[PDB]
Design an enzyme around this catalytic site. Sequence first.
Site, PDB file in Angstrom:
ATOM      1  N   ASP A  87      -0.502  -3.417  -7.517  1.00  0.00           N
ATOM      2  CA  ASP A  87      -1.406  -2.311  -6.967  1.00  0.00           C
ATOM      3  C   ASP A  87      -2.228  -2.653  -6.043  1.00  0.00           C
ATOM      4  OD1 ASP A  87      -3.300  -3.866  -8.208  1.00  0.00           O
ATOM      5  OD2 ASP A  87      -3.331  -2.586 -10.165  1.00  0.00           O
ATOM      6  N   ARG A 103      -6.242  -1.139  -2.534  1.00  0.00           N
ATOM      7  CA  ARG A 103      -6.109  -0.867  -3.779  1.00  0.00           C
ATOM      8  C   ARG A 103      -5.481   0.344  -4.074  1.00  0.00           C
ATOM      9  NH1 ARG A 103      -5.573  -0.078  -8.720  1.00  0.00           N
ATOM     10  NH2 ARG A 103      -6.469  -1.463 -10.367  1.00  0.00           N
ATOM     11  N   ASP A 130      -3.152   1.304 -12.657  1.00  0.00           N
ATOM     12  CA  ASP A 130      -3.705   0.096 -12.927  1.00  0.00           C
ATOM     13  C   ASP A 130      -2.195  -0.686 -13.363  1.00  0.00           C
ATOM     14  OD1 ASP A 130      -5.216  -2.356 -13.365  1.00  0.00           O
ATOM     15  OD2 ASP A 130      -5.367  -2.074 -15.314  1.00  0.00           O
ATOM     16  N   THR A 131      -1.749  -1.763 -12.582  1.00  0.00           N
ATOM     17  CA  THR A 131      -0.597  -2.478 -12.798  1.00  0.00           C
ATOM     18  C   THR A 131      -1.251  -3.540 -13.545  1.00  0.00           C
ATOM     19  OG1 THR A 131      -0.846  -3.511 -10.465  1.00  0.00           O
ATOM     20  CG2 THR A 131       0.978  -1.533 -10.932  1.00  0.00           C
ATOM     21  N   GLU A 138      -1.660  -7.665 -14.215  1.00  0.00           N
ATOM     22  CA  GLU A 138      -1.703  -8.963 -13.345  1.00  0.00           C
ATOM     23  C   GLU A 138      -0.518  -9.496 -13.450  1.00  0.00           C
ATOM     24  OE1 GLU A 138      -4.428  -9.095 -11.401  1.00  0.00           O
ATOM     25  OE2 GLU A 138      -5.229  -7.302 -12.386  1.00  0.00           O
ATOM     26  N   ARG A 158     -12.022  -3.747  -0.668  1.00  0.00           N
ATOM     27  CA  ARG A 158     -10.516  -3.205  -0.379  1.00  0.00           C
ATOM     28  C   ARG A 158     -10.617  -1.605  -0.198  1.00  0.00           C
ATOM     29  NH1 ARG A 158      -8.546  -5.049  -6.368  1.00  0.00           N
ATOM     30  NH2 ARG A 158     -10.111  -3.361  -7.020  1.00  0.00           N
TER      31      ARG A 158
HETATM   32  C1  THP Z   1      -9.108   1.327  -8.707  1.00  0.00           C
HETATM   33  C2  THP Z   1     -10.496   1.152  -8.288  1.00  0.00           C
HETATM   34  C3  THP Z   1     -10.977  -0.088  -8.791  1.00  0.00           C
HETATM   35  N1  THP Z   1     -12.474  -0.514  -8.421  1.00  0.00           N
HETATM   36  C4  THP Z   1     -12.973  -1.601  -9.099  1.00  0.00           C
HETATM   37  C5  THP Z   1     -13.236  -1.498 -10.557  1.00  0.00           C
HETATM   38  C6  THP Z   1     -13.062  -2.738 -11.188  1.00  0.00           C
HETATM   39  O1  THP Z   1     -14.216  -3.524 -11.207  1.00  0.00           O
HETATM   40  P1  THP Z   1     -14.335  -4.788 -11.995  1.00  0.00           P
HETATM   41  O2  THP Z   1     -13.677  -6.064 -10.993  1.00  0.00           O
HETATM   42  O3  THP Z   1     -15.985  -5.171 -11.903  1.00  0.00           O
HETATM   43  O4  THP Z   1     -13.630  -4.763 -13.404  1.00  0.00           O
HETATM   44  C7  THP Z   1     -12.042  -3.217 -10.509  1.00  0.00           C
HETATM   45  C8  THP Z   1     -10.489  -3.239 -10.759  1.00  0.00           C
HETATM   46  O5  THP Z   1      -9.694  -3.441  -9.786  1.00  0.00           O
HETATM   47  P2  THP Z   1      -8.280  -4.489 -10.071  1.00  0.00           P
HETATM   48  O6  THP Z   1      -7.455  -3.764 -11.379  1.00  0.00           O
HETATM   49  O7  THP Z   1      -7.593  -4.556  -8.982  1.00  0.00           O
HETATM   50  O8  THP Z   1      -9.041  -5.738 -10.960  1.00  0.00           O
HETATM   51  O9  THP Z   1     -12.062  -2.613  -9.049  1.00  0.00           O
HETATM   52  C9  THP Z   1     -13.184   0.488  -7.937  1.00  0.00           C
HETATM   53  O10 THP Z   1     -14.583   0.420  -7.945  1.00  0.00           O
HETATM   54  N2  THP Z   1     -12.542   1.730  -7.471  1.00  0.00           N
HETATM   55  C10 THP Z   1     -11.563   2.124  -7.559  1.00  0.00           C
HETATM   56  O11 THP Z   1     -11.027   3.175  -7.380  1.00  0.00           O
HETATM   57 CA    CA Z   2      -4.376  -4.650 -12.067  1.00  0.00          CA
END
Ligand code: THP
Ligand code: CA
Length: 129
Positions: free
Chosen positions: A15, A29, A34-35, A37, A75
């Site tokens: 993702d 992103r 959510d994919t 890891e 991102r």
């Molecule tokens: C998809 C997405 C993720 N995020 C943030 C929330 C999550 O924060 P936390 O890092 O604090 O858990 C994290 C999840 O992305 P990843 O799944 O790439 O880790 O990215 C956003 O803020 N906005 C979004 O649209």
């Molecule tokens: Ca992920």
Amino acid sequence: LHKEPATLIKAIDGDTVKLMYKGQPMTFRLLLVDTPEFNEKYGPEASAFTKKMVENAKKIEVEFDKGQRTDKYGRGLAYIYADGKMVNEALVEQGLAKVAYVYKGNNTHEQLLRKAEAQAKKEKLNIWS
Ligand SMILES: Cc1cn([C@H]2C[C@H](OP(=O)(O)O)[C@@H](COP(=O)(O)O)O2)c(=O)[nH]c1=O
Ligand SMILES: [Ca+2]
């Protein structure tokens, strides 16, 4: 919403992808999904799916939603298309991502993606198997 050009720089995982957008490198992103890891079950398969889809595309496009365009990690947050197919949707159709991270104001394609997830879940695909 509207599509804008970008070119691939590098596939990262299921993702996240590195693209050149308006002439600048950025990590994107994918919105609303959510994919796993890479180290989790179905991770490698998601990474490979996305990698293949972006690397084989003739034309990559970015579509920002109406809200925030960058997350707290810098991102870009977008729907990414590969020859007109949404990568976010394709992952979900395949049971390689869940609908997730649905924040108000960047949720334009929520119901599209939920409809895809319901069908994946019924085929019991991958994540849903
Ligand atoms: C998809 C997405 C993720 N995020 C943030 C929330 C999550 O924060 P936390 O890092 O604090 O858990 C994290 C999840 O992305 P990843 O799944 O790439 O880790 O990215 C956003 O803020 N906005 C979004 O649209
Ligand atoms: Ca992920």
